[PDB]
Amino acid sequence: VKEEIQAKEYLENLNKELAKRTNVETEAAWAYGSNITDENEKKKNEISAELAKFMKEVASDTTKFQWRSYQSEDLKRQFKALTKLGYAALPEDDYAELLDTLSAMESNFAKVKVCDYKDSTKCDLALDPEIEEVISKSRDHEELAYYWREFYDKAGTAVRSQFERYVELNTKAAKLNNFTSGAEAWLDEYEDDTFEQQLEDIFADIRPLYQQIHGYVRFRLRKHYGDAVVSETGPIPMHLLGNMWAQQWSEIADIVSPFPEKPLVDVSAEMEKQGYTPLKMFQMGDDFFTSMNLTKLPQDFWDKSIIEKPTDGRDLVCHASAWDFYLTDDVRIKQCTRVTQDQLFTVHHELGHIQYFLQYQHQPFVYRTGANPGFHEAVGDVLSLSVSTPKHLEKIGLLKDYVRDDEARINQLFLTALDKIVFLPFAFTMDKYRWSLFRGEVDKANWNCAFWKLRDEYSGIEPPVVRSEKDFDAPAKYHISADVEYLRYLVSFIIQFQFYKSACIKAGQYDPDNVELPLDNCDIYGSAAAGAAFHNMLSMGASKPWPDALEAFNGERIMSGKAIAEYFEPLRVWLEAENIKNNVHIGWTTSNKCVS
Ligand SMILES: *[C@@H]1O[C@H](CO)[C@@H](O[C@@H]2O[C@H](CO)[C@@H](O[C@@H]3O[C@H](CO[C@H]4O[C@H](CO)[C@@H](O)[C@H](O)[C@@H]4O)[C@@H](O)[C@H](O[C@H]4O[C@H](CO[C@@H]5O[C@H](CO)[C@@H](O)[C@H](O)[C@@H]5O)[C@@H](O)[C@H](O)[C@@H]4O)[C@@H]3O)[C@H](O)[C@H]2NC(C)=O)[C@H](O)[C@H]1NC(C)=O
Ligand SMILES: *[C@@H]1O[C@H](CO)[C@@H](O)[C@H](O)[C@H]1NC(C)=O
Ligand SMILES: *[C@@H]1O[C@H](CO)[C@@H](O)[C@H](O)[C@H]1NC(C)=O
Numbered sequence: 264v265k266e267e268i269q270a271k272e273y274l275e276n277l278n279k280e281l282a283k284r285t286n287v288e289t290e291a292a293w294a295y296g297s298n299i300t301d302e303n304e305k306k307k308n309e310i311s312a313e314l315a316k317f318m319k320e321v322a323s324d325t326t327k328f329q330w331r332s333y334q335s336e337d338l339k340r341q342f343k344a345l346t347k348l349g350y351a352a353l354p355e356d357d358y359a360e361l362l363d364t365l366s367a368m369e370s371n372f373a374k375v376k377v378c379d380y381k382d383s384t385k386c387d388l389a390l391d392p393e394i395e396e397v398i399s400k401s402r403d404h405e406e407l408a409y410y411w412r413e414f415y416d417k418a419g420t421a422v423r424s425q426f427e428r429y430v431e432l433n434t435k436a437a438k439l440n441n442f443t444s445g446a447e448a449w450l451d452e453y454e455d456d457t458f459e460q461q462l463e464d465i466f467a468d469i470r471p472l473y474q475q476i477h478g479y480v481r482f483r484l485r486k487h488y489g490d491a492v493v494s495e496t497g498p499i500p501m502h503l504l505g506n507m508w509a510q511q512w513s514e515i516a517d518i519v520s521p522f523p524e525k526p527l528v529d530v531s532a533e534m535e536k537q538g539y540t541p542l543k544m545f546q547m548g549d550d551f552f553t554s555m556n557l558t559k560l561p562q563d564f565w566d567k568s569i570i571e572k573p574t575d576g577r578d579l580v581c582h583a584s585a586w587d588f589y590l591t592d593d594v595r596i597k598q599c600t601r602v603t604q605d606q607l608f609t610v611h612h613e614l615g616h617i618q619y620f621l622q623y624q625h626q627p628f629v630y631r632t633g634a635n636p637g638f639h640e641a642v643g644d645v646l647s648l649s650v651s652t653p654k655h656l657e658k659i660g661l662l663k664d665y666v667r668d669d670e671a672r673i674n675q676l677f678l679t680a681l682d683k684i685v686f687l688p689f690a691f692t693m694d695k696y697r698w699s700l701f702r703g704e705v706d707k708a709n710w711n712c713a714f715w716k717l718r719d720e721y722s723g724i725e726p727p728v729v730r731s732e733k734d735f736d737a738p739a740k741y742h743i744s745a746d747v748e749y750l751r752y753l754v755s756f757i758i759q760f761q762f763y764k765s766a767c768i769k770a771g772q773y774d775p776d777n778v779e780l781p782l783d784n785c786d787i788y789g790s791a792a793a794g795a796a797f798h799n800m801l802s803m804g805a806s807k808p809w810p811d812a813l814e815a816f817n818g819e820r821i822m823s824g825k826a827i828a829e830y831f832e833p834l835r836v837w838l839e840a841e842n843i844k845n846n847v848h849i850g851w852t853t854s855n856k857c858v859s
């Protein structure tokens with residue numbers, strides 16, 4: 264009770280100390296991600312080991328405080344965050360091995376190089392950008408399969424043994440914190456003992472819509488490739504979906520769009536024609552934020568960021584990332600930026616993270632993070648939703664001669680759906696798979712097909728060629744080799760529509776009883792009211808539980824699929840009718856593609 268006065272001073276000092284200590288770990292991590300070398304790996308891992316040691320002392324020292332006895336919700340909440348040790352709870356030697364494993368994987372992934380399909384001499388092709396360019400633009404189904412195979416063999420199957428040890432150590436670490444496994448560890452970040460159920464329920468409401476999109480896309484792909492490549496009743500061969508992991512299908516919109524003779528938005532060629540640069544694209548992102556009365560990017564951002572792929576022979580992690588350094592105004596992005604419409608969305612996504620950093624940088628160290636991981640992921644996407652509208656793309660002069668009729672509107676809704684709906688069953692399987700390994704629910708002899716079973720069951724997709732337990736495929740996705748929780752993205756795609764809906768209403772850009780203000784053509788650019796709400800929420804960091812953060816934004820406390828259903832309602836109506844009209848088969852048979 265009266266001990267709380269001394270405890271407050273303890274927290275003030277320790278918070279500031281953790282910030283300064285993390286800053287050093289973060290610089291070392293940045294160094295590695297920007298320049299992968301044996302020497303920089305050593306540094307990175309050794310620094311983190313040192314910080315883990317300090318963390319162990321900190322968790323120990325908290326037991327000197329009767330902190331659960333305290334009056335202040337705020338002090339109790341801060342102390343609680345400090346007891347949460349993570350991997351740091353592992354014994355010295357164990358933590359060292361974990362770190363060496365994580366970087367062995369993350370590095371292997373970033374170092375992947377395949378040979379040219381047309382030329383077995385030219386073997387310096389990397390995922391970003393050589394391979395991803397083919398996956399997104401080639402319509403030679405056999406070339407597509409070739410690249411799919413080479414990549415998965417190298418980014419997935421090579422790190423099997425490493426991944427095995429990683430699950431062991433994650434599990435051990437989780438138990439040392441008295442969680443059942445890493446699943447329950449990850450899920451703790453959401454402060455809600457029913458969070459899993461809530462998601463199952465939401466997915467359940469959304470699933471039928473996904474089913475229809477799946478059916479229609481399969482139908483259209485059959486006309487393009489033939490029935491020899493695409494069956495009517497089988498899962499879709501994933502390598503035809505424009506994307507290496509088939510998480511989003513917007514890259515093949517030119518062949519599966521509802522009205523092929525009406526405008527389909529693809530501003531990449533205009534960006535190039537108008538001489539866009541990575542630097543331009545970021546400056547535009549900056550403009551969007553400042554136009555909403557949010558915070559200008561600081562000078563440290565422009566000085567220290569990496570916004571193009573470096574042209575020395577160096578290895579590096581090209582997967583887009585945003586870094587907070589826990590001082591004042593030292594925030595950065597690393598992105599291997601290309602001049603395309605999707606990349607413009609990515610830029611806004613990453614600047615969403617940066618804005619979050621800046622908004623809560625005045626918070627105590629333990630509150631300098633998302634309300635929950637999903638929130639951090641949503642921020643950028645809320646703006647990207649606006650940026651993607653014809654309304655906005657016409658404004659910045661990238662969309663020309665556009666006629667917004669009923670048919671064009673459907674093409675746009677479908678395009679967004681190939682991004683926003685398609686993704687959801689992907690996001691789920693990502694952690695569903697890992698959760699099941701963490702919880703020890705799959706025998707090691709079953710690990711790979713247990714992956715593809717989930718991809719089948721939820722997404723209705725399957726590998727181009729036959730896989731087995733001789734292959735190991737999950738780490739072919741970045742966030743799996745790099746040990747990054749994925750449920751964040753699912754939470755994001757649900758709640759980003761709650762944010763966007765309410766942002767649009769506050770901007771006077773959405774009225775449901777008004778045909779001239781439709782949610783799917785809302786641009787919040789320049790809205791002070793919208794930015795205001797963002798500020799109220801983002802400036803909180805993790806100071807209160809996420810319910811209180813959402814309440815701050817728009818007065819609501821519940822994660823809901825209502826808003827994302829509201830957005831796509833007009834597409835549902837059209838697509839249900841269209842599938843009936845064309846006698847489109849819905850659903851899929853079990854996949855013959857992973858042998859046990
Ligand atoms: C993971 O979950 C674990 C639960 O399984 C948990 O492990 C337990 O942590 C306990 C620490 O809180 C620890 O409890 C201590 O046990 C000592 C004796 O245990 C020994 O013999 C056991 C066999 O019988 C062995 O298995 C053990 O290895 C030990 O060798 C006790 O002597 C000790 O006591 C002291 O501390 C209490 C604390 O008092 C609290 O604070 C104030 C005092 O300042 C009190 O006023 C207040 O009321 C409050 O109770 C004192 O009361 C007492 O006088 C002694 O000073 C203590 O009970 C336990 O041993 C340990 N393991 C097991 C198997 O139980 C981990 O902590 C969890 N990890 C995380 C991250 O939470
Ligand atoms: C990468 O790190 C190495 C040492 O590991 C160093 O010699 C080199 O200068 C760095 N390269 C770049 C481009 O910074
Ligand atoms: C900008 O933000 C300030 C405080 O954050 C607020 O008072 C002001 O209304 C905002 N600007 C506009 C034009 O609304």
Ligand SMILES: C=C(C[SeH])C(=O)N1CCC[C@H]1C(=O)O
Nearest residue numbers: 510582583584585609612752
């Ligand atoms: C570029 C990012 C932001 Se860290 C990313 O990883 N994204 C953007 C949305 C989900 C996802 C992905 O790669 O799968």
Ligand SMILES: [Zn+2]
Nearest residue numbers: 612616639640
């Ligand atoms: Zn992100």
